[PDB]
Design a protein around this ligand. Structure first.
Ligand SMILES: Nc1ncnc2c1ncn2[C@@H]1O[C@H](COP(=O)(O)OP(=O)(O)OP(O)(O)=S)[C@@H](O)[C@H]1O
Ligand SMILES: [Mg+2]
Lengths: 49, 132, 217, 441, 111, 341
């Protein structure tokens, strides 16, 4: 439960960084561009377990 | 993958400033939804190909249906500019609504026709068509 | 360079089109035009059928909310909701028939051809009665007319026998192995083609989280 | 010692990279060339040279490009410009003046000692010393294992980790320096082969070479590259190397040692190297195919004879007086070739264009240089379509911030193609060039 | 068509040399022989001479190029000051005609 | 993008080595400098410039030498001239244009992979992984030893041997890269310290620094060099490495891999390295001693006041008419010093 989930989350974060790295080249409305961000949330039955 | 939350943000070119944060495409006008959806989808597709594990794409092509059904001219220009900047190849499918921009940014055209219940397909460059 | 691109598209006895037809597409980006209800979406649907694992026919019409057609209707070639009578005149072809499609990707010093052959045997409409076969060729001498000649000169075994003596050919009876082989050959992610099919006509975005948690990752 | 001076003089006289260093406009040229490699090149060069007057444009850029091509700084195959080794060497020298990763480190000494030991062991053919060395290494490994099992796990220091990372990056990134050299060697070998073929023309040699299926263009660099790529084709160690690198990258000391671009380069070493290695085989195949196609033409003797005749004619051409118009207009003897006929036997597209209208309106505004209302602008420039134009003018007026009055009406009468009459009850506007001179459209 | 004089003959010989240079380093594929005027200017200045202004020499070269285009050996100039050499010159400057013209010019010089 | 253009323009404007390369007389001067570092220098420069007119020798040679001294490509301390990093960089660039050792070889790939493994193992704090890797390496060595005892001794081929030898030489010669950089950093640190002291002249700082025995003039390059030489002082590995080098030196492939100068360079690596390493510490000690002597001199305030007065005098001197003889001969107000009877 600890190792597998945490490793998967870390890999997902690294991959997301890699994805948002290349977004900056393409130009949105002049003087603007887009960036994707993620936040971590823990809830539900996990605590109970 | 269900232990995260995602959001998009618009950041000005010079400097680094949050200008607008979004979790979707709600409350927008007609053209805004189309441009946002096309931009995010094409960026995700470009990543999803070979450059996912780096290197250049091996299968580069993308099909758009009913292109520019609700936007104006400038929005279409931005769309084409971004699509070419991403480095792919596009095929367009439109009714006779707009053809100037297509003539400006394409090289070959296909004309379909129906007469009864059959169909006829013709292909031609623009130079030959101009002489008629 | 080293990037494959679509170059031409075939069609034979499919949907509205009848007989033999083909179209050429320049690799610099091409346009398709025609009056309303002339067959534009049919060509793209036929192309899309060959790649994704679950087609969404005529998606762009509704903006991304509903699907409206199915494979059998295209194969037999219905041309309307119909009138209702003794003879279903709103159906182009009845009884035993054959349909075959093919697509061609080209790259510098390379050429790859795909395609499929389907047929019925008797007057029926069950989904199980659809005899199907998918192909993947490498040599240039493989052509659609050759496949049709082989089919008319024999049967399923006659078609399968091409791999035994020919080269650069791999028939697949099940689509799953075909897709696995294609993905291994092209070195692409597991959800690329379904993502392309979804992006073909989607014009909204309810929440990016669904897109990322179902397609991208 | 003087031989060195002579060689330096020759190098200053000959080597194109040094000549580019001696060039007056070296900074702009180097910046442009480095940016490009990441017809249209002339456009980019002219655009860059534009805002650098300080200290023709198109003509000078073309002349410089052609001079460098003659100097073989870059090559031109069919319609494209390709780089050589000298460009990369000069670029490296130029950008190395900022920051260089030091090599005189203890870690480098350790690696050198290990490699020296490996070489000395490998070159030995004795079957006894190898066994003794293996036994000694196993004994040392067992000692280390016993010490570790005693609880002596050694973790390196922060500075040590930084130095190790820097040295690893420096040694790893140096694998891509020799790529252009092989292509240059192949091209020069091909040119020498073509010169030898044309000089020889003997058909027996051409027939023998065409019959022979053995690979042409044989240089030691080709063999070295082939061996390198053949050992590179084994992915078993490549996967382990990639996994080890990705494991290393997740360490707190990484931001203190390498910047973003270096980390990005290190993350994708394996696939990038494989693709780069593959990229040269196609070039070799195309070169061989073109050589074989040229050989099959069988026109080398024709070209040799025609060149000899042209040389003879140009030798004769130095004994005539070109300062006389009468001699220059004296007819020669050449049969008419490709004689054509004697002329005669003696018996809902288009729609609207925006850019042109915008440009013409801008030209009218700048040439008049005074405020103009809609009526005069319509009179001077009658429209094809009455609508789609009033809206454009009103939109420009509103966007520019120029005020528009709606309390007064101006009547403009227009006649379409099919005669008839229309009356437009437009409001009043005033248009000037200065306000709207700095807004894109 | 009219006959050919010595100035046009020398220009044709230079263009033939250019075509030889293009043809030597050529392989499979569709390509064209294009030469800029500025490259051709000094070589013809070597024989004819040099005029006071570059405008005079440029006008003379343009006139000669138009005269040769009238014979179908080249085409009109493009937007980048270049001309295209048609392959017909290969049959115009075949070795037999080259030898005949060389002998005739040698006789012209010698007496 | 344009930032790199500006940086390269500035580099052309600033870097002394680029200025030397862009000079008209670069080749002969570079050859003379290479010969020298292998009054007297100016005389030799004039000698070389003499029989190369082609294209007052003493008049111009001194001017070029002094300009390059101002350009700082050569450092003049008291009466002697010494080279710096830029000159050596230019020399290396010039001599590299002829022959460059190939770097895209399989041996370098193997070395890269093995060093990656070594560093990754060394940076892992977990004990279980260390134990597992140790056992796996022992097992692999045992398998290789069993194969060798089975009679499978392998010897590198002649081409492979030459490749390895050339790679070894390339790696070994890299040890002498950045010796002068430390010296230049120490010189610039000395200049910065002197300027800071003069700009300050507060006697408290000088007294505290003199009282403090902490060694000043500390640079990161100094720390790296100190660690490198501390590891270098272990002669046990040096002797073994030298013995291996001597053993390798006698092989049939030596003439076909390297020339005589390369063999000479590989012959005396350890002694020359020790000599050059020892040479740096003496220079650092001299620099520290001179810094302390200048601090103990205690004339910074006087020099600062004299500089301010000279600045004021030169500012005022721009408002007079120097074109008139009478004003140039007007007597000034200066008492005589050291009058002779
Ligand atoms: N499943 C079906 N059932 C009945 N008719 C069908 C079916 N599929 C296609 N058709 C017929 O095929 C035509 C529609 O196909 P298309 O011409 O491609 O539509 P379309 O090209 O999207 O029209 P536009 O130009 O986009 S509005 C009509 O004549 C339909 O009657
Ligand atoms: Mg639809």
């Amino acid at each position: 439960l600890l190792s597998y989930i945490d490793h998967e989350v870390s890999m997902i974060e690294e991959r997301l960084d890699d994805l948002n790295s290349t977004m900056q080249r393409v130009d949105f409305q002049p003087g603007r561009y887009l960036r994707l961000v993620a936040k971590k949330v823990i809830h539900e039955s996990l605590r109970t377990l | 993958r269900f232990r995260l939350e995602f959001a998009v943000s618009v950041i000005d070119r010079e400097g680094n400033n949050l200008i607008e944060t979004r979790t979707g495409s709600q409350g927008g006008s007609g053209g805004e939804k189309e441009i946002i959806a096309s931009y995010v989808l094409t960026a995700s597709l470009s990543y999803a190909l070979c450059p996912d594990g780096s290197s250049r794409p091996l299968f580069g092509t993308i099909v758009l249906d009913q292109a520019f059904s609700r936007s104006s001219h400038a929005v279409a220009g931005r769309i084409i500019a971004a699509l070419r900047e991403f480095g792919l190849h596009a095929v367009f499918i439109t009714p006779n609504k707009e053809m100037r921009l297509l003539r400006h940014h394409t090289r070959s055209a296909v004309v379909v026709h129906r007469r009864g219940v059959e169909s006829s397909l013709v292909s031609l460059s623009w130079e030959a068509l101009d002489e008629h | 360079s080293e990037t494959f691109i679509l170059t031409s598209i075939e069609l034979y006895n499919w949907g509205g089109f009848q007989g033999y037809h083909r179209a050429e597409i320049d690799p610099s980006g091409t346009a398709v035009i025609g009056p309303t209800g002339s067959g534009k979406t049919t060509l793209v649907d036929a192309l899309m059928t060959l790649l994704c694992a679950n087609p969404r026919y005529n998606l762009a019409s509704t903006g991304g909310h509903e699907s409206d057609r199915d494979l059998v209707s295209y194969v037999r070639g219905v041309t309307g909701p119909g009138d209702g009578g003794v003879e279903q005149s709103h159906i182009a072809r009845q009884g035993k028939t054959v349909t075959a499609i093919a697509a061609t990707l080209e790259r510098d010093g390379a050429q790859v051809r795909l395609g499929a052959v389907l047929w019925f045997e008797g007057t029926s409409s069950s989904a199980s009665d659809l005899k199907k076969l998918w192909l993947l060729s490498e040599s240039p001498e493989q052509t659609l007319e050759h496949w049709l000649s082989q089919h008319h000169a024999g049967g399923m075994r006659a078609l399968r026998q091409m791999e035994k003596d020919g080269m650069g050919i791999w028939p697949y009876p099940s689509k799953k192995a075909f897709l696995a082989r294609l993905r291994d050959y092209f070195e692409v992610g597991e959800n690329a083609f379904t993502l392309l099919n979804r992006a073909a006509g989607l014009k909204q975005l309810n929440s990016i989280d669904e897109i990322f948690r179902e397609l991208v990752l | 010692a003087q031989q060195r001076s002579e060689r330096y003089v020759s190098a200053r006289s000959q080597h194109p990279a040094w000549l580019l260093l001696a060039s007056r406009r070296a900074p702009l040229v180097l910046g442009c060339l480095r940016t490009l490699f990441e017809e249209d090149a002339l456009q980019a060069l002219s655009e860059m040279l534009a805002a650098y007057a300080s200290q023709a444009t198109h003509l000078q850029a073309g002349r410089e490009l052609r001079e460098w091509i003659k100097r073989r700084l870059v090559v031109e195959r069919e319609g494209r410009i390709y780089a050589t080794d000298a460009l990369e060497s000069a670029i490296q020298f130029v950008d190395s003046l900022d920051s260089r990763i030091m090599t005189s480190t203890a870690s480098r000494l350790s690696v050198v000692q290990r490699e020296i030991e490996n070489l000395e062991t490998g070159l030995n053919p004795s079957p006894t010393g190898r066994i003794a060395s293996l036994r000694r290494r196993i004994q040392d490994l067992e000692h280390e294992l016993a010490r570790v099992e005693a609880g002596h796990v050694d973790v390196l220091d922060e500075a040590q980790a930084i130095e190790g990372m820097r040295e690893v990056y420096n040694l790893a990134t140096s694998l891509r320096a020799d790529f252009r050299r092989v292509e240059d060697s192949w091209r020069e070998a091909d040119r020498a082969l073509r010169h030898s073929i044309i000089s020889e023309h003997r058909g027996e040699i051409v027939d023998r070479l065409l019959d022979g299926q053995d690979a042409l263009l044989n240089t030691p660099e080709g063999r070295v590259f082939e061996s390198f790529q053949q050992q590179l084709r084994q992915s078993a160690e490549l996967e382990v190397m990639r996994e080890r690198l990705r494991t290393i990258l997740r360490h707190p000391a990484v931001p203190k040692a390498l910047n973003r671009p270096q980390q990005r380069e290190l993350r994708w070493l394996a696939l990038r190297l494989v693709r780069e290695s593959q990229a040269v085989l196609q070039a070799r195949a195309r070169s061989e195919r073109d050589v074989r196609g040229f050989m099959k033409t069988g026109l080398a003797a024709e070209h040799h004879r025609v060149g000899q005749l042209l040389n003879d004619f140009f030798n004769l051409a130095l004994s005539v007086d070109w300062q006389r118009q009468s001699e220059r207009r004296k007819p020669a003897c050449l049969p008419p070739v490709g004689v054509a006929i004697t002329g005669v036997p003696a018996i809902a597209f288009d729609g609207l264009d925006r850019e042109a209208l915008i440009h013409d309106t801008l030209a009218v505004l700048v040439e008049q240089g005074r405020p103009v209302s809609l009526g005069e602008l319509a009179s001077l420039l009658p429209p094809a379509h009455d609508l789609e134009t009033f809206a454009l003018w009103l939109a420009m007026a509103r966007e520019a911030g120029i005020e528009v009055l709606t309390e007064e009406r101006q009547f403009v009468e227009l006649v379409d193609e099919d005669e008839q009459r229309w009356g437009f009850n437009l409001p009043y506007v005033g248009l000037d060039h200065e306000a709207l001179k700095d807004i894109d459209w | 068509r009219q006959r050919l004089n010595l100035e046009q003959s020398l220009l044709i010989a230079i263009l033939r040399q250019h075509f030889i240079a293009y043809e030597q380093e050529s392989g499979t594929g569709a390509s064209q022989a294009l030469v800029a005027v500025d490259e051709l200017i000094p070589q013809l200045q070597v024989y004819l001479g040099e005029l006071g202004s570059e405008a005079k020499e440029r006008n003379r070269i343009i006139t000669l190029l138009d005269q040769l285009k009238g014979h179908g050996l080249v085409s009109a100039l493009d937007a980048h000051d270049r001309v295209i050499i048609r392959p017909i010159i290969t049959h115009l400057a075949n070795p037999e005609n080259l030898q005949a013209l060389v002998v005739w010019l040698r006789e012209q010089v010698e007496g």
